[PDB]
């Protein structure tokens, strides 16, 4: 028992992190096979950081302008190209630590692990969710550009996020590993901002089920509600609508706890309308929305990876 | 910016995890050089699990009774011995992935990373603190015995915890890597229970400083307090006393924020006496006590490891 924000073991990703330097900009790159992936903003100078034409900036570069270091061993760049907002550097050495991997793009509401890095050296690992507004509430300092987010399934690493920048509210924006931004953000200097967010309803319900599995029951009740009536309440409190597919996805947790999904919706309705009245759920005084139904099932049931 | 529960990168520990089977009990072991460390309870059967004499149980064992598997490769046990509550199995192969390491014992109030494992395969990583009552609020299912907790300093892994058992409130107890239990717990079947806990005051103050660094200031005030007057309030709310050494340890964070330590104590006094009145600090509606001053400085300033 217990319930923690749990990241995937990071070893398979640690062996891919390298340092990329170009001019006076140093950031992180991801070394898979004989390609290093990094944010294209590495080719930018401070004056360039206003409205850059990256195609012009890149044609002016030579392979030898890119200094790539894997630990204390230098990698020879032998080609370079741009894909959307990422750069692809061919090096003369395939990474012998390349795991089996995929490049996947995730949905708002999904979670992933982040390996924060600086100067190509991993610093820490933590769990994040992609917000409905396509930002993530990360923990990043300068030099963390190019740190990646990922999930692991058996032995295969699905990379889903590369970090690019911090927005004015302190939240973070980046791309998938094809270089396409999550949300309406750009890698140039603008007044861009997060814009309005919502709470991930199906994840809150999953977490209430985690709580019942772990012995917190004070918020349960005899009442039930209809899906339409719950969704009218979700809308008032800025929760996102609950669909029949969400209900279906919650079936296994409902069957394990014996609590009908619509019954747990009635409990959530009461919690939004009454607050918590000084009590806690799984050590939190707030309704937590950064655990998916899958996250709850891995942690309360117990699957590993190799 | 941002502030997350952040674990150390787990790769160096993943390469040490193995599976140990004896009879019908399977759990995790830690393989360093040519020794595998695991809980001595592995030699116990269900009837033995009432008041076992482990010295008798162990003399009845042969090396060949211990099946040790590193991935899908079997390790030959060539010796065995008991140290306090851990078992030490000599194998015929030194682990080529052995990091530089130390066995350290930590203090209540300190934090560490936990690599949860099952069948010798790492499952997830998360951050924990050692509670004042010598338990930890972990996330563990059956088969997680022998999972370890650790910190990393530059390239050196300081192992501080091996997991043994779950107590009736759902919290967890284990040993240091010398096999000495944290707190008044034993590896036999009793009615043992956690017993009363307190809140780690210096860690709460560190986290308030993290919040100010990250832009949360609503809880600040002009007031100050004396150390004795704060400690009278800490005692009412079951917080642990604040010492002059705690004040000294908070000096760097105080100097960075310009907020005197005793001023931040006056803020904490107000928060205990008034609650939070519907607001949050670093995304929490509770006063968080599982970040040390060191944790705040690594994350709000930014050190890595190799
Ligand atoms: C580094 O990830 C990056 C990418 C885009 C824009 C930007 N500005 C400062 C760093 C940075
Ligand atoms: C496995 O860590 C362990 C250690 C002591 C007592 C005990 N009971 C069930 C598992 C276990």
């Amino acid at each position: 028992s217990g319930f923690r924000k749990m990241a995937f073991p990071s070893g398979k990703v640690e062996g891919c992190m390298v340092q990329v330097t170009c001019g006076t900009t140093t950031l992180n790159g991801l070394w898979l096979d004989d390609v290093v992936y990094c944010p294209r903003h590495v080719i930018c100078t401070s004056e360039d950081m206003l409205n850059p034409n990256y195609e012009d900036l890149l044609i002016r570069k030579s392979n030898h302008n890119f200094l790539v270091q894997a630990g204390n061993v230098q990698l020879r760049v032998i080609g370079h190209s741009m894909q959307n907002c990422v750069l692809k550097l061919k090096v003369d050495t395939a990474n012998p630590k390349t795991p089996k991997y995929k490049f996947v793009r995730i949905q708002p509401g999904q979670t992933f692990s982040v390996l924060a890095c600086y100067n190509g050296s991993p610093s820490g690992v933590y769990q994040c969710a992609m917000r409905p507004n396509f930002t993530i509430k990360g923990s990043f300092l300068n030099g963390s550009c190019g740190s990646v987010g990922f999930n692991i399934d058996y032995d295969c690493v699905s990379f889903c996020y590369m970090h690019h920048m911090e927005l004015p509210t302190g939240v973070h924006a980046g791309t998938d590993l094809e270089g396409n931004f999550y949300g309406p953000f750009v890698d140039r200097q603008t007044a861009q901002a997060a814009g309005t967010d919502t709470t991930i309803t199906v994840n809150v319900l999953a977490w209430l089920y985690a709580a019942v599995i772990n012995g917190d029951r004070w918020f349960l009740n005899r009442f039930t509600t209809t899906l339409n009536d719950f969704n009218l309440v979700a809308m008032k409190y800025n929760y996102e609508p609950l669909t029949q597919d969400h209900v279906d996805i919650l079936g296994p947790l409902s069957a394990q706890t014996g609590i009908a999904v619509l019954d747990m919706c009635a409990s959530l309705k009461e919690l939004l309308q009454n607050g918590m009245n000084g009590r806690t759920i799984l050590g939190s005084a707030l309704l937590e929305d950064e655990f998916t139904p899958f996250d709850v099932v891995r942690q309360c049931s117990g699957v590993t990876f190799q």
Side-chain angles (χ1 to χ4, degrees), chain A residues 1-177 179-306:
Chain A
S1 67
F3 205 76
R4 286 275 187 187
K5 288 185 109 62
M6 199 176 281
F8 286 102
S10 54
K12 287 188 174 55
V13 179
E14 293 169 48
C16 301
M17 294 318 300
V18 303
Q19 187 197 279
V20 172
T21 296
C22 176
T24 48
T25 298
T26 290
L27 57 80
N28 305 283
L30 181 81
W31 181 23
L32 301 165
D33 292 319
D34 66 346
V35 174
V36 171
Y37 298 82
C38 70
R40 73 184 176 165
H41 181 94
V42 69
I43 71 184
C44 283
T45 61
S46 284
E47 57 269 47
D48 296 331
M49 294 181 185
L50 295 157
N51 201 353
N53 176 323
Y54 289 96
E55 295 94 335
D56 277 336
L57 288 193
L58 187 55
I59 189 56
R60 292 172 195 161
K61 318 288 288 168
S62 299
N63 292 335
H64 81 81
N65 290 147
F66 298 96
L67 165 55
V68 178
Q69 319 199 44
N72 53 8
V73 180
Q74 183 189 357
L75 299 175
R76 181 176 177 178
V77 176
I78 70 191
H80 59 270
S81 52
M82 192 167 50
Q83 184 178 4
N84 305 307
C85 296
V86 301
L87 192 65
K88 296 175 69 178
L89 308 177
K90 297 291 181 183
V91 293
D92 64 4
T93 302
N95 183 354
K97 297 179 206 234
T98 305
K100 197 196 179 330
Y101 70 95
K102 301 195 292 189
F103 287 170
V104 299
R105 185 179 176 95
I106 61 164
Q107 289 293 316
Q110 292 187 246
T111 55
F112 55 101
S113 303
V114 168
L115 176 69
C117 306
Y118 301 90
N119 306 114
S121 302
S123 188
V125 63
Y126 57 87
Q127 192 76 353
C128 293
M130 175 64 62
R131 296 310 307 170
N133 65 2
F134 285 102
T135 65
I136 72 164
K137 295 171 176 290
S139 174
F140 289 122
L141 299 169
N142 305 316
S144 64
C145 291
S147 304
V148 302
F150 61 94
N151 285 285
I152 301 188
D153 195 49
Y154 192 44
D155 62 315
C156 176
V157 179
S158 293
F159 295 99
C160 59
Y161 176 83
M162 191 169 264
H163 186 46
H164 290 242
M165 50 187 215
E166 178 170 306
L167 298 172
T169 50
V171 300
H172 297 107
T175 64
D176 65 26
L177 271 294
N180 302 301
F181 262 93
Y182 286 101
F185 309 111
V186 296
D187 54 351
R188 57 186 171 85
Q189 183 76 276
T190 67
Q192 57 197 325
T196 67
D197 209 20
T198 53
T199 296
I200 307 156
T201 308
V202 58
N203 285 3
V204 177
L205 297 172
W207 172 79
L208 291 171
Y209 279 107
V212 171
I213 287 169
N214 272 283
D216 282 328
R217 308 181 53 92
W218 62 260
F219 50 86
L220 298 181
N221 52 60
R222 72 186 297 165
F223 316 113
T224 199
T225 187
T226 64
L227 186 55
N228 300 326
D229 281 9
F230 174 80
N231 272 332
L232 286 167
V233 165
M235 186 179 290
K236 188 270 183 182
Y237 289 90
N238 191 242
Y239 269 54
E240 172 155 7
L242 197 71
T243 65
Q244 185 56 45
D245 196 54
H246 292 147
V247 172
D248 295 339
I249 287 150
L250 292 168
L253 283 170
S254 177
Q256 184 188 356
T257 60
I259 292 164
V261 171
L262 288 172
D263 291 7
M264 186 75 78
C265 288
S267 286
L268 180 54
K269 186 185 290 207
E270 278 316 291
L271 287 168
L272 293 167
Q273 287 177 350
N274 308 334
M276 271 195 227
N277 191 49
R279 305 169 275 199
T280 61
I281 305 178
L282 285 173
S284 175
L286 292 179
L287 297 169
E288 170 77 31
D289 80 338
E290 287 209 356
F291 302 98
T292 66
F294 173 101
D295 298 346
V296 175
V297 166
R298 64 181 291 273
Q299 194 173 158
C300 300
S301 306
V303 183
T304 55
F305 313 91
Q306 270 178 321

